[PDB]
Each structure stands twice: as structure tokens, then as C-alpha cells.
Amino acid sequence: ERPTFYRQELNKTIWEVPERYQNLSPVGSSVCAAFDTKTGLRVAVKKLSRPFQSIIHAKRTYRELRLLKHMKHENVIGLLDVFTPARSLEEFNDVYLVTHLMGADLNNIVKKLTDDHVQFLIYQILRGLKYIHSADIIHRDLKPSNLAVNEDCELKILDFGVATRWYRAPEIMLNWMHYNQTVDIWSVGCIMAELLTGRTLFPGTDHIDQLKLILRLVGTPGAELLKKISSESARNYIQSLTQMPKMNFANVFIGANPLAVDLLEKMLVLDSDKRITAAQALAHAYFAQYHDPDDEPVADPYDQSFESRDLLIDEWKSLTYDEVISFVPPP
Ligand SMILES: Cc1ccc(-n2nc(C(C)(C)C)cc2NC(=O)Nc2ccc(OCCN3CCOCC3)cc2)cc1
Numbered sequence: 001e002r003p004t005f006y007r008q009e010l011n012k013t014i015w016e017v018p019e020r021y022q023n024l025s026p027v028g029s030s031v032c033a034a035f036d037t038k039t040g041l042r043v044a045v046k047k048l049s050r051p052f053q054s055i056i057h058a059k060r061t062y063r064e065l066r067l068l069k070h071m072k073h074e075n076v077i078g079l080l081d082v083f084t085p086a087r088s089l090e091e092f093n094d095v096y097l098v099t100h101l102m103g104a105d106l107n108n109i110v111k112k113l114t115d116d117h118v119q120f121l122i123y124q125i126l127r128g129l130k131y132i133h134s135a136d137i138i139h140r141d142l143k144p145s146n147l148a149v150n151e152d153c154e155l156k157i158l159d160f161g162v163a164t165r166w167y168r169a170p171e172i173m174l175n176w177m178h179y180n181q182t183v184d185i186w187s188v189g190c191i192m193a194e195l196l197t198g199r200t201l202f203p204g205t206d207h208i209d210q211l212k213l214i215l216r217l218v219g220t221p222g223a224e225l226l227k228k229i230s231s232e233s234a235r236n237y238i239q240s241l242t243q244m245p246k247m248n249f250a251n252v253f254i255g256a257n258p259l260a261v262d263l264l265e266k267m268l269v270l271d272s273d274k275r276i277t278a279a280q281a282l283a284h285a286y287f288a289q290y291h292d293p294d295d296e297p298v299a300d301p302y303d304q305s306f307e308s309r310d311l312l313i314d315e316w317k318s319l320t321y322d323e324v325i326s327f328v329p330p331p
């Protein structure tokens with residue numbers, strides 16, 4: 001049966017939720033922390049904003065719900081519940097997502113950390129990324145504020161949807177036509193470095209300053225990378241730069257665990273084809289105390305074919321409705 005709903009206003013916004021959820025309190029703007037009476041858990045409830053206003057919003061709504069329904073891994077946000085107060089498709093206009101409430105984000109603890117903490121936090125990030133990447137999902141926006149952490153140091157990857165640019169792989173800023181999942185490894189590299197040093201690795205003021213700072217560390221592209229650049233304009237510009245060697249990372253990251261330094265060198269490589277993968281990184285010596293090859297699961301395949309489709313607002317709306325109706329909560 002349909003739960004009984006109750007209405008209230010929170011920060012200019014109306015909230016209509018199952019009575020199951022008590023004590024709503026805003027956190028971020030929209031999201032409320034709440035008490036879930038059925039499980040005894042503190043939960044986060046996200047009310048989507050104008051989910052079906054346009055085709056763009058409608059497809060984004062569907063994209064987010066479909067993805068969240070798929071995620072079933074300890075180090076990735078999961079869906080505890082999804083509901084709408086609507087009793088039918090015709091009046092369906094609002095979507096609420098329920099997830100576990102975590103203590104804070106990584107931006108609000110590195111606002112620096114011991115090596116054992118770095119090992120454990122980066123391990124869990126990689127473990128979640130192995131999972132996301134095995135489903136052919138690319139995060140694309142990994143940064144400390146997209147990582148939620150408890151006082152246990154348990155970590156989950158999320159995407160709320162501290163500048164994004166600072167953690168972005170250089171190919172994304174060169175507007176590269178295609179890019180692959182190791183863009184996320186670049187981001188992990190940036191995050192790990194910042195945890196070890198307590199300073200943003202590459203605090204660029206814009207995308208040009210960003211690449212400038214990046215090339216300073218990793219050096220200008222070599223012959224082998226240049227071979228793979230199809231853009232005339234980019235090739236010419238890159239080749240016209242004053243050439244710089246890759247820095248020695250052990251001197252950049254002075255006093256850091258040598259295993260950590262080694263890992264960083266394997267993550268922060270300009271040529272994306274040469275970066276360590278998440279699955280390979282888990283087997284790196286730096287994570288020797290946490291690595292367990294039989295507890296680093298992959299994901300079921302995830303069908304993203306809908307991304308290539310151009311549908312009407314009411315079609316994306318109906319598809320999202322079906323997804324709300326078919327939701328099966330975790331045990
Ligand atoms: C359009 C869109 C937007 C976001 C996503 N997305 N993607 C992912 C992954 C699987 C790739 C990491 C996750 C999301 N969506 C997502 O994390 N939504 C979400 C859900 C709840 C949120 O609550 C913010 C409050 N936090 C802080 C307290 O601890 C946990 C909850 C914030 C964001 C997918 C599509």
C-alpha cells in the first residue's frame with residue numbers, strides 16, 4: 001500500500017514525504033537530513049528541483065534515478081528509497097531520493113591527514129571506482145566535496161551535480177572529443193596529493209592557468225603522446241611551448257611515504273592510456289593492509305543506450321515513473 005504522506009515547508013520549499021521519515025532538517029542547497037522510522041537510520045532526502053520542466057531536466061532526472069538504482073557497492077552512494085506523492089502518472093511532478101546520511105565530506109576534513117588515513121580513504125575511492133568503471137560509468141567530476149565520509153572513515157562516492165577544474169583531467173579541459181574512465185584516476189591523483197600535503201595540487205584560476213600548473217609538474221607532452229593528438233591547433237600550440245621535463249615527484253612530495261609517491265607518479269600521467277587503472281591500483285603496494293582481491297566486486301552491466309535517444313518530456317517523465325514504481329528497496 002501507498003504510505004501516508006505529510007506536508008511541510010522548509011527553506012521556501014514544500015516537502016511532501018511518507019510519515020516513515022521524521023525530523024526533516026535542511027543540509028544543502030535540495031536535501032534534508034531525516035530520521036527513517038522503519039530502519040532506525042538517519043537518512044538524506046533529496047527533493048529534485050523542477051525534474052520535468054524541460055526535455056533536458058526530464059532526461060537528467062531519469063539519468064540520475066536509473067544510475068542510483070543501479071549502484072550497489074559499499075563505497076558508492078546507494079538508493080534506500082525513491083518516492084513521489086503522486087498517485088498516478090497524470091499528477092506525477094515530483095521525485096524524492098533517499099540515501100544514507102554520512103557525517104561530512106572530504107572537503108570539510110581536509111579544510112591534514114596521516115598516511116594510514118590516506119591509504120584507507122584512497123583505497124575505498126579506488127574500490128568504488130573499480131565498481132563504477134566496470135559498468136562503463138565515468139564519474140567525470142571527482143573532487144573532495146563529492147566524497148562523503150563518516151567518523152569511522154568509511155567513504156562513499158556521490159555526485160552532488162572548491163573549484164571543479166582543480167581535479168579535472170587535462171583532456172577534459174582541451175575539450176577532447178572522446179575521453180575514457182582514467183579521467184577519474186587523474187582526479188584521484190589530485191585528491192590523494194592534496195590529502196598528503198594539505199594543499200590543492202593544481203589551483204588554476206581558469207583552464208589555461210590549470211594546464212600551465214599541470215605541465216609544470218608532469219612536463220610537456222612527449223613524441224609518443226603527440227602521435228595521438230588529432231587536433232592541428234592543439235598540436236601546434238603544445239609544440240610551441242617551452243619544453244619542460246617531468247619533475248621528480250619524491251622532491252615535490254618530500255617526506256611522503258615512497259609507496260604513495262610511486263602511486264601518484266602512476267596516476268598523474270598526461271597520456272591517459274598510461275595511467276594506472278582503478279583495478280590495478282588496488283593491487284599497488286601502498287594498499288597492502290587493505291587490499292583483498294576477493295572483496296573488490298565489479299558491477300552488473302549498465303545500459304546507457306537511452307543517452308543516444310531524443311524523447312518528449314512526457315516520455316522521459318513516464319520512463320522515470322516506471323522506475324519509481326519498479327523500485328525494490330534493499331534488505
Ligand atoms: C544528473 C545526475 C546527477 C548525479 C548523478 N549521480 N551519479 C552518481 C555516481 C553513481 C556516478 C557517483 C551519483 C549521483 N547522484 C547523487 O549522488 N545524488 C545525490 C544523492 C544524495 C545527496 O545527498 C547530499 C547529502 N549527502 C551528505 C550526507 O551524506 C550523504 C548525502 C547528494 C547527491 C547522476 C546523474
Ligand SMILES: CCCCCCCCO[C@@H]1O[C@H](CO)[C@@H](O)[C@H](O)[C@H]1O
Nearest residue numbers: 170171178179180228270271272273
Ligand atoms: C597541454 C596538455 C595536453 C594534454 C594531453 C592529454 C592527453 C590525454 O590522453 C589521451 O586521452 C585520450 C582521451 O581518452 C585518448 O584517446 C588518447 O589515446 C590519450 O593519449
